[PDB]
Amino acid sequence: AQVINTNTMSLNAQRNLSTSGSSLATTIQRLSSGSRINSAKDDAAGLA
Amino acid sequence: AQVINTNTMSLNAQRNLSTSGSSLATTIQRLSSGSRINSAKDDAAGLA
Amino acid sequence: AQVINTNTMSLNAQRNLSTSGSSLATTIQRLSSGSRINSAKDDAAGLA
Amino acid sequence: LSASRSRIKDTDFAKETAELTRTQILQQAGTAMLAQANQVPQGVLSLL
Amino acid sequence: LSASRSRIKDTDFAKETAELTRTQILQQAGTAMLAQANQVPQGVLSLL
Amino acid sequence: LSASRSRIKDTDFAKETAELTRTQILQQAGTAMLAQANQVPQGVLSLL
């Protein structure tokens, strides 16, 4: 069946792209700062 | 014999087109995501 | 004869590419490690 | 362990593209043949 | 004490670049596949 | 004894680089030929 109102394949690809691109910000940040723990999000005791 | 109420060839061509187009979604999804197993529909022990 | 459902040339080329790419990992590893014997796969009496 | 895990989960990029091309060609063949089949039953009208 | 503190806070530069490269490749693959998926539904027009 | 042990275990850096270069060329040749082989079967469409 061929439809035009909804494009499930197109709908998916977007989600995959966002998931893949999420982590690049974190890796760039921790590679530029020089340290692995920059906020309490990453570790819970290491900062303590 | 010519018949106009039914068109057997037309009815047949639709099924073949749908069958060919079924696999496109799976191949594009597994090519965009980068992984061969995205859901339990593909494997039953590989994911575990 | 022209067919679509099979592409023998394409099927072949894949095999040749994998064959050529087999040895590069071994070469890189034995160049980074600095030693010619890293496991018993390479030799049987040399390690002993 | 990390090397062993990747043999049953990752995608082979060389293999998927051939299937992509095959499905793409089959779709166009099916569409053209469906259009031809739809146009076929017209010639009865000349008899009337 | 200063040497001991460094084990749980500093970045490993040899390990951190690999994820940069991997994510960079994954993003390009995702973008190309997204464009393909968007362009796919065009073929229905020829039927009309 | 230390001199004797080194003749059968250490890598020869002069010989491995040639093999590295040869394999690297073969990979590119194979990839280009594979892409051409994949693109070949498109010509059947004009007949339809």
Side-chain angles (χ1 to χ4, degrees), chain B residues 7 10 13-14 17 21 24 27 30-31 34-37 46, chain D residues 8-11 13 16 20 23 27 31 34 37-38 41 44:
Chain B
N7 198 339
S10 158
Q14 298 172 43
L17 180 50
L24 187 32
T27 180
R30 80 165 67 196
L31 182 53
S35 281
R36 198 190 70 96
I37 303 178
Chain D
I8 75 166
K9 192 195 183 44
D10 285 345
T11 317
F13 262 73
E16 222 71 42
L20 183 72
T23 46
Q27 281 224 333
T31 315
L34 176 49
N38 269 356
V44 47

Side-chain angles (χ1 to χ4, degrees), chain A residues 2-4 7 9-10 13-14 17 20-21 23-24 27-28 30-31 33-37 46, chain E residues 8-11 13 15-17 19-20 23-24 26-27 30-31 33-34 37-38 40-41 44:
Chain A
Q2 280 84 344
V3 299
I4 318 147
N7 213 19
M9 331 189 9
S10 169
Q14 295 176 38
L17 179 49
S20 311
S23 190
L24 172 72
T27 179
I28 271 180
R30 68 163 55 167
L31 191 67
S33 79
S35 84
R36 194 184 71 97
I37 307 177
Chain E
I8 70 169
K9 196 182 176 83
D10 298 298
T11 321
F13 268 73
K15 154 162 171 313
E16 206 47 80
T17 78
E19 312 64 21
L20 180 73
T23 49
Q24 279 180 350
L26 276 191
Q27 266 209 319
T31 313
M33 299 312 316
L34 182 45
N38 275 358
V40 155
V44 69

Side-chain angles (χ1 to χ4, degrees), chain C:
Chain C
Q2 272 100 329
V3 299
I4 298 138
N5 273 303
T6 314
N7 192 153
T8 65
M9 344 193 167
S10 165
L11 253 162
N12 184 304
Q14 295 181 43
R15 202 226 315 159
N16 274 128
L17 180 50
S18 147
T19 287
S20 308
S22 100
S23 191
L24 165 70
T26 280
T27 290
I28 274 181
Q29 172 214 30
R30 69 162 56 171
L31 203 71
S32 162
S33 166
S35 285
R36 193 186 71 102
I37 300 177
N38 320 56
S39 88
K41 187 172 41 164
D42 308 344
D43 196 282
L47 59 157

